Amino acid sequence: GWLKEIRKLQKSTHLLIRKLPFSRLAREICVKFTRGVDFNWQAQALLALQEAAEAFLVHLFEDAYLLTLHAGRVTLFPKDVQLARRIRG
Amino acid sequence: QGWLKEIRKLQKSTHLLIRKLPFSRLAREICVKFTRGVDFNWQAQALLALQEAAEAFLVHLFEDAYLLTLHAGRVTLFPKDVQLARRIRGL
Amino acid sequence: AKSRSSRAGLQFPVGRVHRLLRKGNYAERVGAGAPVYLAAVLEYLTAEILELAGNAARDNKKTRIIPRHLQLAIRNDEELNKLLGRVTIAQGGVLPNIQ
Amino acid sequence: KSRSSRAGLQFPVGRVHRLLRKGNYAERVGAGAPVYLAAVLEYLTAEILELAGNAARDNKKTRIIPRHLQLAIRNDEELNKLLGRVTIAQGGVLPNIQAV
Amino acid sequence: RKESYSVYVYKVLKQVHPDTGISSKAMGIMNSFVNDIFERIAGEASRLAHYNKRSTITSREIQTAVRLLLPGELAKHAVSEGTKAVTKYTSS
Amino acid sequence: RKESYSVYVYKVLKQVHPDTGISSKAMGIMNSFVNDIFERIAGEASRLAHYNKRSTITSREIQTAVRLLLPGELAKHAVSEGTKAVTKYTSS
Amino acid sequence: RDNIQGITKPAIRRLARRGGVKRISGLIYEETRGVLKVFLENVIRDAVTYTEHAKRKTVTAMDVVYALKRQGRTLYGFG
Amino acid sequence: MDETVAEFIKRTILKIPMNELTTILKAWDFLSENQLQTVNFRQRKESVVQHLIHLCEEKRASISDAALLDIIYMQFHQHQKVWDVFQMSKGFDMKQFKNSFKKILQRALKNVTVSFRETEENAVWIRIAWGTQYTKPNQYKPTYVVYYSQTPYAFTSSSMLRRNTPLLGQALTIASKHHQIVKMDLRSRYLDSLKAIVFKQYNQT
DNA sequence: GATGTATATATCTGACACGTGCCTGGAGACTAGGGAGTAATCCCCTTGGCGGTTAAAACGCGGGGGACAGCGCGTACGTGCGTTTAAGCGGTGCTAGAGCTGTCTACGACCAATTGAGCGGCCTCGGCACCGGATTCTC
DNA sequence: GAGAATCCGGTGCCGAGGCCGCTCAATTGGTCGTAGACAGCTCTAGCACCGCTTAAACGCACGTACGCGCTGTCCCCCGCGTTTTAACCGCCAAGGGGATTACTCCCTAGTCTCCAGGCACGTGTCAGATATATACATC
């Protein structure tokens, strides 16, 4: 079932989060930390944010899934993600 | 009981939990194997410095690795826990 | 005939920081107003951590600061724990933390 | 007569010496240092690109793409410890599958 | 002949506390504290003299280095105190 | 007017491989590789000009920085290759 | 109007399949939307500072590369 | 006060050159001249505005006074923007016009910001900060309308934010005593050429 | 055994390896002056060892405490499938914004005299560490 | 409902803070080159938007694969008491080399001058991308 889905996604390299929702999220979060000022992201830097966010989330879910196989689970509960951040610090 | 008193006692004082001369002989044995032939002088404060770093590192490692035994429902550590705790960080 | 910290209204020195910031080779030109600001920042940080340490020192009915008091004053406060994360204070021990 | 060809290198030597003068690293820069530095950089570049080219060859493609550097770094042991805190753009991951 | 920062920490401690003594070992910790933060900020602000292709370190670069190297509320108090020191330094 | 390290990586690749092409994006990775290792070693050796109270950067400090910044076998090959470059640089 | 639900219910599933997780639970969809947000603050607040210093209203790629290098997670591929 | 308008006033005065900054602050009429005498006008600009904000930290501030400062800034930099010319037809005090325009625009969308300023030849300079029904109004991309009571003509500033152009046109037509609005070919940089090409035809119809 | 699973080629599509012009940063030359490498020295910090004690570690033992394996109920999750909504292409406009080219000025290196702020050595005495004693707490 | 945990007091002891001598490094002051703030102009590349269109998400119905609590079993760390042992304290000798000073010398830095290399620009053309179609691998 899922096994044809993993081995297709660990082969390709393209982005998974779509570009426009991530751009709207970045323009939302950026305007709170600059005292209500807009900015103008270059069209290259949003790719850098998105690549760092994808790499961080993929490494995070790999470590969380390494935690899930320890306790006999296969399912990835929210107890698992909030514990793989306090260990890493 | 007993352990409930020992955790309260050892977390209060700030001593050295490892004896001096075995740790010093271990550090000298490791230092001999690199760039052989010559000996190496150690100042008496440097071995204390390295001992404080090693004790703080091992205490932080056990306190970090213990949280993967309450998570599995167990009470007791295992070498799987310590090796997984080093696997998470990247050391 | 007149001190730099006395113009600065501070307690940390100014000429020593300026001497280190020239001799450290951080930049080939050092602005004049910089080390006064930097010494004020260092004074506020040391004042904050000693102000947090002395309360725990009087909490243990002591008047002489030992490193355990600095360990507790670092680890109990949130923002200093954010700052001094990867630092093992010598002769320090750990927090009382059970279960 | 150029200092790149005089030492038998390929990386430049004058540019590295220019970046060590204007880099605010020490007040004086010797002459025996930047040739050593360019030699070490050339060895590391060849060390990466050999594995990258072999992994590109084994995928039957005549062009180097960042997935191939990702595979060559994460399959080598030494560069796993040298580059252990590095994300790579257009990267992907290793084919990691594990069961219970 | 080998200087340190013991006297100044002692003066700050006698300022913000009446008679709280400090041992000769813990004072050493304070040396390795404030020979360290000065290594970060006045190191890292030097980096901001290199990305913008400058050659000076003014108060503005140290201000941005304090905005980076400290968490939120402590950074706000520090940047509020430093310019307060500078303004009474300027009108000497 | 804004330099890079593309030509030299291309020359090394055509040296150790006959015709293996490299894309214009992955070459960019090589720029951010070797504008990075040079930031470490020639940064960190500068620190060894400060602990020993010196002011120069000779070949010996770069040699010790390579002994520190690299794992074992790669460091051994690098220190064996660098002095081999220096000795044929000296007798010019 | 949702503003964080641009991260969808299967985009988290695609990231978990790339990570290699067989079966996601439920409230993960409400958890990851927290964590990502926190991480973006510790880039963007760290990246709006550098572009504030150089008197530029444009947040270039080099600024995000420098902020990610300062956080510890070095990014290569752009510049 | 809030901690948003201070950045706006600081950015606006940083855009002002030192050649006429005292002219701007005397014409703006918001601080005491003793506090003008206190501020050093000889150090660099990256602390003069800090001292001026620290004057405005204590006494008074708003979004309206900052908007009026923005209006006076825009009135002396007409070489920068590019203007557009409108005209109404099919059909007087200005106070009822101000109230009608502000109420119609605040009934059209949720969040707008309107600001007026009186200028001779019966001129009014109208700064509009558009917004949505969920967000704050963007102060940094305004829209300026030069309106005259006598002539049915209005000078229009372009902006990044379109899609509110026919809304503003119909709201200003209903806000005035009119029914039609046009959009001529006249789009230029300098206001005096548009002034001449309107008034040579209007005064001599 | 139909559903993947790998391969032939279609062509088409654009990146890219390459060729040229060209501006400027790297090489040649050489003086000069501080950095330092070598030489000597003397003390000072470390190493080695004698010896005696005393906490501290090693070792049997048994007993409860916990880990592990099976298991039943069930519920929260994957999947199939029609819809409907939002994301991408791509195209236009089009103007704020990087940047970069002069200028002139405040400003910080650079340097001679000079003196007190801070560093090294010393000497208590109160703070404190430890040892012994009197007042609570759960099984 | 009494051995164990907490607070208290007395006494030695030893380092923390006050004090003096002093010296060298920080201050003051006058000089000059220049780094950078400041203004204005110019190309460019990012944002807003819109029409389409369509790929994917959304919502739901349902079957069922794990989550989890329970319970039985068996093994396996911890507390305890005895024996053994090496860590430590204090001393005493001695000596290897760490820190200091001198002195010459040499090697890198600065400035000038000359030109070969590395960068921006432009262009045919091969590498692959995706797409369709067809020969193997399999629960």
Structure tokens given for H25: 């602050």
**Helix ranges restricted to H, chain E:** 6-16, 26-34, 37-51, 59-69, 72-90
Say if the Cβ atoms of D95 and A47 lie within 8 Å. no
CA G2 centroid distance within chain:
18
List the beta strands (DSSP E) in H96-191: 113-115, 118-119, 123-129, 143-148, 153-157, 180-188
Which positions in chain E touch C37 (Cβ < 8 Å)? 59, 62-63, 82-83, 85-86
Strand, coil or helix: B10: helix
Q: Parse chain C into domains and list their residue ranges.
A: 1-99
Give the integer Cα–Cα distance in Å for G70 and G51. Answer: 15
- Strands A40-41 and E21-22, how do they pair? unpaired
How many Cα atoms within 13 Å fall on the side-chain side of residue E82? 26
**Residue G46 contacts residue G65 (beta carbons within 8 Å):** no
Give the integer Cα–Cα distance in Å for H45 and H65. Answer: 21
Other C-beta atoms lying within 10 Å of the C-beta of residue E67: 18
Look-up: residue for tokens 């968490």?
A: E71
Look-up: residue for tokens 């000065």?
A: E38
Report the Cα–Cα distance between both ends of chain A, in Å, rounded: 36
CATH number of this structure's domain C1-99: 1.10.20.10
CATH number of this structure's domain A14-89: 1.10.20.10
CATH architecture of the domain covering E1-92 = Orthogonal Bundle (1.10)
Give the integer Cα–Cα distance in Å for G18 and A60. Answer: 11
Distance from CA of E65 to the nearest CA of C (A): 10
- Strands H143-148 and H123-129, how do they pair? antiparallel
**Helix ranges restricted to H, chain D:** 3-6, 14-21, 33-58, 66-75, 78-82
CATH number of this structure's domain B15-90: 1.10.20.10
Kindly report the CA angle at E44 between E43 and E47, in degrees rounded to 5? 105
- B32 to B18, B35, D39, F66, H50: CA distances (angstroms): 22, 7, 31, 22, 62
Q: Parse chain B into domains and list their residue ranges.
A: 15-90
Give the closest residue to F51 by CA, choosing from D26, C38, B31, D22: D26
Give the integer Cα–Cα distance in Å for F68 and F65. Answer: 5
Plot region of B35 (φ>0 → left; ψ -120 to 50 → alpha; else → beta): left
Give the integer Cα–Cα distance in Å for D100 and D85. Answer: 28
Strand, coil or helix: F21: strand
CATH number of this structure's domain D1-98: 1.10.20.10
Look-up: residue for tokens 């069961």?
A: D99
Determination approach: cryo-EM
Give the integer Cα–Cα distance in Å for H78 and H40. Answer: 29
Structure tokens given for H146: 């030069």
Say if the Cβ atoms of F37 and D36 lie within 8 Å. no
**Residue H146 contacts residue H155 (beta carbons within 8 Å):** yes
Paired with H144 in beta bridges are H127
- Strands G74-75 and A40-41, how do they pair? unpaired
Tell me whether A32 touches chain D (CB under 8 Å). Answer: no
Give the closest residue to G36 by CA, choosing from H197, D94, A17: A17
- A89 to A82, B88, C76, C85: CA distances (angstroms): 11, 11, 16, 9
- Strands H118-119 and H143-148, how do they pair? unpaired
Strand, coil or helix: G23: strand
Interface test with G, best of F6, F29, F32 (most G CBs within 10 A): F32
Other C-beta atoms lying within 10 Å of the C-beta of residue F30: 25
**Residue A55 contacts residue G18 (beta carbons within 8 Å):** no
Strand, coil or helix: F16: helix
Interface test with F, best of G75, G76, G78 (most F CBs within 10 A): G76
Give the closest residue to D56 by CA, choosing from F23, A9, A14: F23
> Which residue from A minimizes the CA distance to H135?
A28
Strand, coil or helix: H186: strand
The phi, psi pair for H126, rounded to 5°, reads -115, 115
How many Cα atoms within 13 Å fall on the side-chain side of residue F21? 7
Report the Cα–Cα distance between both ends of chain C, in Å, rounded: 61
Look-up: residue for tokens 């013991």?
A: E6
Q: Which amino acid is at D42?
A: E
Calculate the angstrom distance between C1' of J40 and CA of H188.
Answer: 20
Give the integer Cα–Cα distance in Å for B55 and G2. Answer: 50
Work out how many domains chain G is built from and give that number: 1
Nearest nt to the CA of G27 via C1' is I76
Instruction: Tell me the residue length of chain F.
Output: 92
Strand, coil or helix: C89: coil
Kindly report the CA angle at E63 between G40 and G60, in degrees rounded to 5? 40
Give the integer Cα–Cα distance in Å for F91 and B47. Answer: 45
The H 34-63 residues near strand J by Cβ under 7 Å are 44-46
C-alpha dihedral, E66 to E72 to E75 to E80, nearest 10°: 130
Give the integer Cα–Cα distance in Å for E1 and H52. Answer: 47
**Residue A70 contacts residue B71 (beta carbons within 8 Å):** yes
The phi, psi pair for A16, rounded to 5°, reads -110, -45
Give the integer Cα–Cα distance in Å for H186 and H87. Answer: 11
**Residue H32 contacts residue H83 (beta carbons within 8 Å):** no
Q: Which amino acid is at G70?
A: R
Other C-beta atoms lying within 10 Å of the C-beta of residue B53: 12
Gyration radius from chain B CA atoms: 17
Structure tokens given for H54: 């620290």
- C8 to C2, C11, E75, E82, F79: CA distances (angstroms): 11, 8, 20, 10, 51
> What CATH number corresponds to the domain at position G5?
1.10.20.10
**Residue A81 contacts residue G28 (beta carbons within 8 Å):** yes
Other C-beta atoms lying within 10 Å of the C-beta of residue D53: 20
Gyration radius from chain C CA atoms: 17
- A40 to A23, A44, A46, B55, H82: CA distances (angstroms): 11, 11, 11, 50, 21
